[PDB]
Amino acid sequence: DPEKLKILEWIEGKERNIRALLSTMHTVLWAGETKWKPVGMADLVTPEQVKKVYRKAVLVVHPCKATGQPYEQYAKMIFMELNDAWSEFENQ
Amino acid sequence: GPAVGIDLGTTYSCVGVFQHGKVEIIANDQGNRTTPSYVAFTDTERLIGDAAKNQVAMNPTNTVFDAKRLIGRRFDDAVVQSDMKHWPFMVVNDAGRPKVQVEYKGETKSFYPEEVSSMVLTKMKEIAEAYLGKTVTNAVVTVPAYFNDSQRQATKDAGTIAGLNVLCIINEPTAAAIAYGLDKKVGAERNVLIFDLGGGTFDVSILTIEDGIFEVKSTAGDTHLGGEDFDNRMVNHFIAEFKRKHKKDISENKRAVRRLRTACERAKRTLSSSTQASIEIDSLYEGIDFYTSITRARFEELNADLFRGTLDPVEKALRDAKLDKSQIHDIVLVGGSTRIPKIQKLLQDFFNGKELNKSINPDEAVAYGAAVQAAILSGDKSENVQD
Numbered sequence: 001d002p003e004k005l006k007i008l009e010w011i012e013g014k015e016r017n018i019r020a021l022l023s024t025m026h027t028v029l030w031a032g033e034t035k036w037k038p039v040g041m042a043d044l045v046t047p048e049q050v051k052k053v054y055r056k057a058v059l060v061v062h063p064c065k066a067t068g069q070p071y072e073q074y075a076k077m078i079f080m081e082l083n084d085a086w087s088e089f090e091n092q
Numbered sequence: 093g094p095a096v097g098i099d100l101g102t103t104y105s106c107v108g109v110f111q112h113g114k115v116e117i118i119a120n121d122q123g124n125r126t127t128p129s130y131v132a133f134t135d136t137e138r139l140i141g142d143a144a145k146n147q148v149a150m151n152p153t154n155t156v157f158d159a160k161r162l163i164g165r166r167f168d169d170a171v172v173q174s175d176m177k178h179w180p181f182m183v184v185n186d187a188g189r190p191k192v193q194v195e196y197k198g199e200t201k202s203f204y205p206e207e208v209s210s211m212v213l214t215k216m217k218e219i220a221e222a223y224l225g226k227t228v229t230n231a232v233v234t235v236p237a238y239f240n241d242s243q244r245q246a247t248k249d250a251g252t253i254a255g256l257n258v259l260c261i262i263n264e265p266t267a268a269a270i271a272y273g274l275d276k277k278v279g280a281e282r283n284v285l286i287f288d289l290g291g292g293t294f295d296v297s298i299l300t301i302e303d304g305i306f307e308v309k310s311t312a313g314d315t316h317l318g319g320e321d322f323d324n325r326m327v328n329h330f331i332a333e334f335k336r337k338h339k340k341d342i343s344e345n346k347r348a349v350r351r352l353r354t355a356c357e358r359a360k361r362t363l364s365s366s367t368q369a370s371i372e373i374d375s376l377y378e379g380i381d382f383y384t385s386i387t388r389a390r391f392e393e394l395n396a397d398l399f400r401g402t403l404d405p406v407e408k409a410l411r412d413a414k415l416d417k418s419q420i421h422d423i424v425l426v427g428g429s430t431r432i433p434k435i436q437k438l439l440q441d442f443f444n445g446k447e448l449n450k451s452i453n454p455d456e457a458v459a460y461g462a463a464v465q466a467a468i469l470s471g472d473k474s475e476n477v478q479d
């Protein structure tokens with residue numbers, strides 16, 4: 001489906017760069033998502049900034065909240081990529 | 093440090109952890125992989141789990157169980173008013189909310205249902221911490237599929253009071269499906285039936301799973317049918333036996349009846365793997381030692397109606413889900429009582445010889461799935477997809 005394809009292409013294109021993912025997550029969220037505000041790279045410079053924004057993001061796409069919602073599959077895909085990107089970021 | 097999965101059960105609770113690529117169901121310090129959902133208050137201490145259940149006969153009015161029947165309910169609820177008659181402990185009304193009232197350290201004390209359940213969760217937390225050698229904060233906790241928002245929020249609150257961060261409240265039948273990796277399948281949707289016969293309740297749930305997304309299609313069962321009822325059928329049998337042998341009636345001695353029930357539950361468990369079981373009780377009533385035997389055949393007979401009756405909620409669930417029995421892809425056994433061979437035979441015959449999913453200890457399956465889910469939600473189970 002087009003929403004799934006959109007997320008797959010986002011995931012491939014950003015190369016598990018956590019800042020690239022967070023700075024563009026607004027482009028892959030479902031219609032009806034109203035909590036997330038687009039974050040610019042200026043707010044993603046320091047490790048402290050990245051952690052704060054990552055934590056906000058996982059709350060939006062959390063699978064527990066998403067359970068039973070039309071967008072559930074897509075939240076799960078985004079959540080798992082963010083987690084992988086965060087773990088890679090921590091390894092640096 | 094890992095997140096844990098906790099099955100907070102009506103009669104027993106169970107904790108697992110996914111670590112090093114495998115789920116461990118964690119044994120308590122008495123060697124038991126499940127722990128009674130019992131809290132006892134005494135002159136000197138608060139006891140939880142095995143130690144609490146073990147002294148019930150000596151301290152019945154200050155030993156609390158069945159908190160899950162009160163959780164998230166109003167005092168004036170029909171369910172609460174009905175259930176209160178069966179309990180030896182006091183339940184009182186506090187501004188519309190039910191509280192258990194007990195004697196503790198020579199003092200009258202009362203606790204909300206979520207406070208009692210927090211004590212059970214605290215014990216399960218400690219069980220996991222002993223095993224892990226580190227503190228446990230994050231958990232997935234399970235509830236019945238039919239629980240409403242009030243009951244779910246009260247269960248979460250129990251977690252918070254136990255010093256846990258509850259990652260998610262998920263459904264018991266869904267947890268069992270997750271344990272078996274049923275949500276990892278792809279392609280056409282699949283219908284799964286969960287047959288869950290526990291210590292106090294019987295739940296039948298039909299789930300449809302497609303691409304790891306669950307839908308609870310129907311639920312059926314009996315909130316007042318479980319292992320305790322099978323114990324009771326044995327108890328009455330042996331009360332008759334004792335009266336005939338000794339010209340004494342133990343029925344009105346509450347301690348003797350409880351001591352006998354404990355012995356019956358143990359024999360029942362033995363009868364799931366052996367065809368006979370022996371009972372030995374020192375000084376059961378007025379100085380008389382009670383020794384006897386019972387066969388698997390006799391146990392099955394004593395419970396014949398209750399066992400075959402489990403098939404009716406199965407039929408009801410199937411029609412509510414609008415499915416034929418030939419349309420069910422997987423059948424999962426959950427709950428300690430599904431270890432009973434006669435139960436397993438009855439269900440398999442119903443499904444015309446189809447194989448049952450029982451490789452995971454049925455009393456551990458819910459905790460097992462919760463543990464998997466807790467790892468996923470913590471970022472500690474990457475790859476494959478999301479189960």
Ligand SMILES: Nc1ncnc2c1ncn2[C@@H]1O[C@H](COP(=O)(O)OP(=O)(O)O)[C@@H](O)[C@H]1O
Nearest residue numbers: 101102103104290291319361364427428429455
């Ligand atoms: N091997 C066994 N054979 C028969 N009954 C058992 C066996 N093991 C446990 N049980 C029964 O299972 C019931 C507890 O079920 P369980 O699923 O562990 O808890 P809960 O119903 O609280 O979730 C008790 O009645 C117990 O006696």
Ligand SMILES: [Mg+2]
Nearest residue numbers: 101102290427
């Ligand atoms: Mg159970």
Ligand code: NA
Nearest residue numbers: 099101104105
């Ligand atoms: Na249980």
Ligand code: NA
Nearest residue numbers: 288290293295
């Ligand atoms: Na049950």
